Symmetry: D2
Subunit: 267 residues, 4 copies
């Protein structure tokens, strides 16, 4: 097993399409012992997490909630047992109010909405690192999920800004994590048919932004030298497990692109 | 005159060291007619703006204030006269609470503070574009001030994240501005001895972060193939005027580095 | 005049569509005194250079030719007069054998051909800097022409590799040039209908690479927030003159994108 | 074993410090069956390759030699047996004449020398891909070794240009490789004490370039959030094996930084 003997916390499962679900599945297949965290609808998440290869504790974590964050290391320790620490942490979380995305004009998003999006999508990467680094082993790994925001694009709007902020946060988390002998990296994935995406795609069913999204998806597979299948989160899940393993031990503050190589090609 | 006949709004003057003061000075020398905006201490700003080569209207603008933003185009029109529009807009504004910078630990900044910093330093670039694009001429230019956040560094901390967000915002502002035939770009300047910097440098007088800042300054001039003088904002002011002119007409969504070429050299 | 009183050498004129022709035209309109250099068909070039706003000396320069390079500073000095030096130098030169481009398979280009292309397109930027820096004034400017090679693309093939090398050469030329108080930068232009392009486009009239090139052109104007007109070299010529002026005095080793902002947008 | 059952060709072994030696060692520990290639001093290389965990065929390959390249797939097939194909290929090869590096002035390198360096260090990545892709399995992986050339630096000089070219070549190799279901990536390593480096460091023992190299090494470990040990090629070897494995299946045309995260930090 790639992750045999490792204890890994995975946030972000909401459906069986969640990138986090597939990260969790592949990690368990590779021998990892998981602790899962979920937001809002815990009973629902439990039903999904029951479909994984193996049992795992499920803890509540709303990254907006300072009490949840303050108690997290303690609750995790209770789950994995005193004297044990985490080897990995996966941040697979994001949010942006509907005003900040889709067909909504970029200029019409109130800062209150943008700020909430940045809180959950970017700042919380630092929040989770702050909470969990004190219970991580040397050689450990923190991984977050990114969508390449180096260029602007239709529809993604303020989430692009939140991802740009996340990339910057990741470089600073790496400075802190290094003191614990821990790496911090992001995986920039290509588009995957998840609940999050269905909210975006669904919000523009018939408008120009919806058409633009479909064009972006077609262009992605065309540009990717090895192609890109939006229906398959496995290549992304494997990439996250690679960073969680001991096989990328000199990479930190960085971004690994699991996108079919699309970002390396203009056309 | 490089900017002969152009009407240009300049935000961000607070002292005679302000990058905005030097942008304003050089622009007037090149024939521009200015409208200035100021925050908080208007009487003080007036005293400084009296030391410019020419007279210019001074309007109050707190970019946190939705009423100030909603009335800005109207107030500007009153200043420059009905039937007239702006050819340029300079955003030279930034803020980050003390908890988000200096020697303060990266993990100890409350999101309330980070959010305020991002509001003023990044979101407000979009706010100003939204307010002013309806009164800009085709061929016009919006310019904001940046500090290269591509890599993490000591002390700059959450302001780095705010600049990463600003770069992303600028790429989206360019999409909107293009509909008006208007360009949007940032100037990434090297370090300049201003009031803002004095707040940072001063906040660490004797701590490791203070030493790190001095090291960064020495490294900057060393790396710059043409050198770098932190005591001189003129090269930066000229670069902004270049983007405000008609001489970079095919550049938008972009970043021009006025940093002595330091970002192009490793050592 | 933007370049009033400046003495500027411009290489690369071959037809009235040459980017160099338009750089030369705009520079003269802005008061520059030019020295032109030409390759191979000097009588032909003379006929074109006669259509510029003002007269200018024309010197032969084959950048492959070590004797031409060794005598260049001397020949230029003879042209502009003893005691006078250059304020600017424009490298607007490129070449790649047909085996290295178009529909030709990437793997089928012999190194002898690739090497010749890199010699003329990249190494010669250093050659010209070496020859001319000893006769340049402090505050001077060297500018070369680039086509963004950060990502691979159809048809451009080995020329992309040559441009990647040129970008690297430019960063090293900046180190040397800085000793003379001289800047070195590239302008990355979007596609322009020139003789060079006609050789590429023409070499694939009816093949997949030809179709791919047309798609790239359509995508360019779509992505550019201010649009892109391939029939108009003026915005590019103005950008080069901006770098030749005193208005970008803190930029060196760098690349300015005159591409309608296309490189800042994914779609 | 990470690479259990995979057949992998590894070029570039010359001493027990060679990055390729450590790639080969770690790959064998992970169950790979290797084919090694060597240049010039085959008896010497044999003596070193005898110190690996397991036996492996050693074939002669001078990447300058068109006959060696034309016969390589045939010779490899003879080594691994008819009906068998390669799963991996490692390019760990570089060369630059002494005129192109060290204390030698950048402008004094003859193109004949630069061209030879680019041939071996960059073009040959395409040469090896061309020769070996016809005998690679789908899901296969080609990996080359890089040193981040995004910025100029002392001493590395024309090798920096060769690496910039290599990065561009890699993006085009990925386009070709994708047709075979094969990935192509580079690993950008931090500095490692090898024979190659000893040639550079040794060539400046007492000159400014030698001092600059020592400063670069100290700065590297300082900037790396997890530190950097130039005496240890293992983290780099593991990173290459990660790309050779099935665990980064959606990454191609790309660069993975095994540098302690140094390239993500300014200071
Ligand atoms: N689906 C894609 O195409 C794609 C591509 C690149 C990157 N990503 C990123 O991958 C990650 C997961 O996205 P996904 O596509 O699997 O979507 P998803 O809908 O399956 O999962 C997103 C998760 O965010 C969690 N979340 C939202 N608010 C939270 C809060 N206040 N506290 C704690 N958790 C909260 C949700 O509960 C949910 O489980 C995100 O960072 C996303 O931006 C997705
Ligand atoms: N000084 C440097 O080294 C340096 C380097 C690169 C970029 N910058 C950027 O240049 C710009 C100007 O900085 P400066 O160095 O001239 O500092 P400065 O102190 O001289 O000016 C900063 C301005 O921000 C304005 N501001 C703060 N909050 C505001 C609000 N709520 N509404 C409207 N205005 C507000 C201030 O009133 C002030 O005039 C900033 O974006 C800064 O980050 C500075
Ligand atoms: N046309 C575009 O779309 C475009 C876009 C971006 C960058 N560029 C670059 O702009 C520059 C000029 O290209 P252009 O489009 O105006 O093409 P052009 O055909 O009008 O000019 C190219 C020049 O290269 C010169 N040249 C070729 N070999 C030479 C040698 N051995 N010695 C001296 N000069 C030599 C030619 O004589 C010619 O004048 C090149 O570097 C090119 O790659 C062109
Ligand atoms: N050592 C470092 O610090 C470092 C850092 C980043 C990247 N790299 C890269 O790693 C790779 C290997 O370098 P290394 O440090 O292990 O040095 P090395 O001296 O141990 O190996 C370099 C190899 O190049 C081979 N080579 C040279 N000319 C050849 C030719 N004509 N045909 C076939 N092979 C030839 C040599 O025989 C040798 O085995 C290179 O691409 C190098 O640039 C090294
Ligand atoms: C123009 C867009 C086309 C391709 C989109 C790929 C993509 C899909 C879903 C993503 O997830 C979120 C998106 C927005 C808000 C919250 C989340 C979360 N969690 C993501 O980040 C990127
Ligand atoms: C590690 C740092 C060393 C060099 C710093 C250069 C620099 C100085 C001042 C700057 O201005 C601000 C900084 C923080 C918060 C608000 C503003 C404002 N306005 C800036 O953005 C960058
Ligand atoms: C896929 C391509 C589509 C757009 C191309 C834009 C473009 C056109 C012409 C160019 O000039 C050359 C090209 C090749 C060889 C020599 C020269 C020269 N001189 C260039 O560099 C870039
Ligand atoms: C300023 C430099 C300090 C750090 C250097 C790291 C480094 C060391 C050795 C390298 O290998 C070569 C270098 C030159 C020519 C051939 C090869 C080969 N093979 C390399 O690419 C990079």
């Amino acid at each position: 097993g790639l992750l045999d003997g490792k204890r890994i916390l995975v946030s972000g499962i909401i459906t069986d399409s969640s990138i986090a679900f597939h990260i969790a599945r592949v990690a368990q297949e590779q021998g990892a012992q998981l602790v899962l965290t979920g937001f809002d609808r815990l009973r629902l998440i439990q039903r999904i997490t029951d479909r994984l290869p193996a049992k795992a504790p499920l803890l509540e974590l709303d990254v907006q909630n300072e009490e949840h964050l303050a108690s997290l290391a303690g609750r995790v320790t209770e789950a994995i047992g005193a004297g044990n620490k985490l080897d990995g942490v996966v941040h697979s979380i994001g949010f942006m109010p509907q005003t900040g995305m889709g067909i909504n004009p970029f200029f019409d998003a109130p800062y209150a909405d943008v700020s909430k999006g940045i809180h959950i999508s970017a700042y919380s990467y630092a929040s989770m690192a702050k909470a969990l680094l004190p219970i991580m082993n040397p050689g450990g790994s923190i991984v977050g999920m990114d969508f390449d925001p180096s260029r602007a694009m239709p529809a993604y709007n303020w989430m692009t800004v939140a991802k740009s902020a996340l990339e910057s946060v990741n470089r600073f988390v790496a400075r802190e994590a290094g003191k614990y002998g821990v790496r911090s990296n992001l995986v920039a994935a290509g588009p995957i048919r998840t609940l999050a995406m269905s909210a975006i795609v669904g919000g523009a069913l018939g408008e120009e932004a919806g058409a633009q999204i479909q064009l972006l998806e077609e262009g992605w597979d065309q540009r990717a030298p090895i192609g890109w299948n939006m229906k398959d989160a496995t290549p992304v899940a494997k990439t996250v497990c690679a960073l969680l393993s001991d096989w990328l031990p000199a990479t930190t503050g960085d971004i690994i692109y699991a996108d079919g190589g699309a970002h390396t090609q203009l056309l």
